[PDB]
Amino acid sequence: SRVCQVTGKRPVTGNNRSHALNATKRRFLPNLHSHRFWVESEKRFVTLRVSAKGMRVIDKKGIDTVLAELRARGEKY
Amino acid sequence: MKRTFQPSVLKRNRSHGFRARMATKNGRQVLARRRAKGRARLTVSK
Amino acid sequence: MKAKELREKSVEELNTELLNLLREQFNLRMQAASGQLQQSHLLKQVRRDVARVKTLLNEKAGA
């Protein structure tokens, strides 16, 4: 399963319908990218992986999510 | 020229021997089902 | 089988456990394999006796 952390994202099952309403099953996916950040307390520059729109919710709290809610119940950097 | 199976002893372990099964999760079910049936022949290579 | 002393100077009771490996089981097993003395209880004198001693040798400190 793709590592999403701050977005809670998982794979999801859905459907497609025709003009005669015939059902074809489809799957949805998290789209991931790796980002570089500065937190100063680690001294090194840090690298994290999250799904799309993830940086737009980390940047809301500056470094608070990066030093806690991201890594503490997620993956190391 | 020949019929039925070959008698060779390494192919008597390399498909169904204890480690060759215990290293596979479905091969551990053979051990679980035979213990549940009460079967004394838990290994069949001899 | 029975003794009147309990966990004093255990270093000599542990040294009896060395003779138990060098002679006393060697002679007893060989004597019974030779059919000598014809006693079936004589080959039963080490069992339940030495367990009482090995139990106290699990606490030989403070002896």
Add this chain to the structure above:
Amino acid sequence: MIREERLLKVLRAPHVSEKASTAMEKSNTIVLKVAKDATKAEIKAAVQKLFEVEVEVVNTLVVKGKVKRHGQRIGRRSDWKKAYVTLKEGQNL
């Protein structure tokens, strides 16, 4: 010396043949009976540790205990080992 005293589980039975008392009247080498493991690495010193008798040369062989015991329940039979040990000047081992 060398090994543990607990290793000396050997030589606890007389030899099965009436040859045991005539072997030294034919040659320099006597026969002994041993368990399923004959302690090949210790046995040349085990005679000194149990009898205070010393030997010049040692050899060990297996005597296969056969299998047939109960037709249908197929009861276990156990193998045994035989030793040939050379005596310089003695005869009682």
Add this chain to the structure above:
Amino acid sequence: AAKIRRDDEVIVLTGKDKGKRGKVKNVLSSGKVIVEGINLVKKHQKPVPALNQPGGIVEKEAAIQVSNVAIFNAATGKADRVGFRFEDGKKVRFFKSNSETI
């Protein structure tokens, strides 16, 4: 409570043997006994090196039932009834057979 015991003589009141004197030798599984002087069984015995008395057959003891046996009174050759009570030691006669209840 026990009712027979090996501590003194008893009288059998049971199948094959009744009104007859003896004493317990040994107790068996689920409650049966062997008693001294019971009428015994013929028994061949297939040949063995053990001593087996002059002529053929051993004439060997047989176990008996324990539910119809009583303690022996000696004085008149009859059964005795007294009851037994004692704590922490070997049981003692309590002497209650005197018609004392209402």
Add this chain to the structure above:
RNA sequence: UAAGGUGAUAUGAACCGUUAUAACCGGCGAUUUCCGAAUGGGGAAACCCAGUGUGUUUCGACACACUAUCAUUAACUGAAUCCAUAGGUUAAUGAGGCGAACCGGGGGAACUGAAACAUCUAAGUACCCCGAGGAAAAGAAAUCAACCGAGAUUCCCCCAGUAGCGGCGAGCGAACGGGGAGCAGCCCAGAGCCUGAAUCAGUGUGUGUGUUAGUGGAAGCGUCUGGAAAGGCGCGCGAUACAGGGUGACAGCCCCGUACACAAAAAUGCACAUGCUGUGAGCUCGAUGAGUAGGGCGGGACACGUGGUAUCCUGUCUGAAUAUGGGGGGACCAUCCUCCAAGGCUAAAUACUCCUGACUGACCGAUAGUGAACCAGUACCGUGAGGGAAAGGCGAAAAGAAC
């Protein structure tokens, strides 16, 4: 508790105890092979090859305990490098394999029901994957109601086979509410005074009560019949006690047993009282759930299939305020009323039964009841997973081959 015992086929020699260290029963502990999570390292399951330290040893080698992996907490050393981190290392705490059912999240048919088939149904079943607890799930309102108010959650009986949905076709079916079963409500987004608060989980002590030793506790004798009686006959005796099962044929009363009487080394479930460890009151002043609510569309889920479709979820683009602010009241607007999302935890009624200790059956009796009543999941067969028989039966006593 006590005079019995040393498993069985399995006899024969023999031995332990009858007074306290003989078995036996109740509790708590010791030691616990090699393989297996299996854990120095390797492997063909019970195999092979090593090191460190200690012991000694003309230095070979064995014992002794020790050496798997990963995370989390506290710290010592630390690669490019600097500071750091990865690796190395010690202590603490957790994970690792296997089981019966219930259960949480995720994947997921065809045949079938529509007397054919395509939306619908089959079905989120069968089956698989990751995993949790005595239950799980759910809960103390961003719910419904409607001027009258209800008010945590859950399961049973109703509302109802109604309101409604549906190639309006087959079929599907709400809740709100009534009866009944169960009955304590708080925390976090902080920290000050307060200071052990009312409480609770575990455990000890005390008591009360189950549960694991146990001992006492009613009454029938003879005679005939017969292989033997408890039958017959004589007539008796017991009851807070005639079920079940035995003793030579069918005794309430011969025996086991039943109603009834009595108690606490140690262990463990419950209740009140209460110490101990942890967690926690009260009061005041702060703080307040932001990529998701909304705005659209696609799809999925709700009884409800896009319809005259709100709610709830999520794939994508767009994207807030701070209380007359915001969600809701089943297209949409205006006016009113209602609740406070974007953060959690609860006991019990509810689901289920491998298993500890017991009691019964309009229960079967060998072609019946478990593959299976007997060393049957054995023989036998299969590359293997897997499949899988036929064989039950004396007597009062074994008295069974003396000879």
Add this chain to the structure above:
RNA sequence: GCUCGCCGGAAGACCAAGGGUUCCUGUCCAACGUUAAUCGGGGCAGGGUGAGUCGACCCCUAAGGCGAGGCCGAAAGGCG
């Protein structure tokens, strides 16, 4: 024990796959042996089988499976 017959690049003798008490001796006939069973690849007991150098094994390992670090797949499972 003696003929006569047949194979003789095999129908001789080893290595290999594989088989495991069958080797040398007494004793027995409940079952086997396509006809008797006195015999034993049969039942029950005895006797003997000693390599560092030949086969395992082990040092070096091909093709190749598994796999620390490391990276995928709701998930069984992917790759190295």
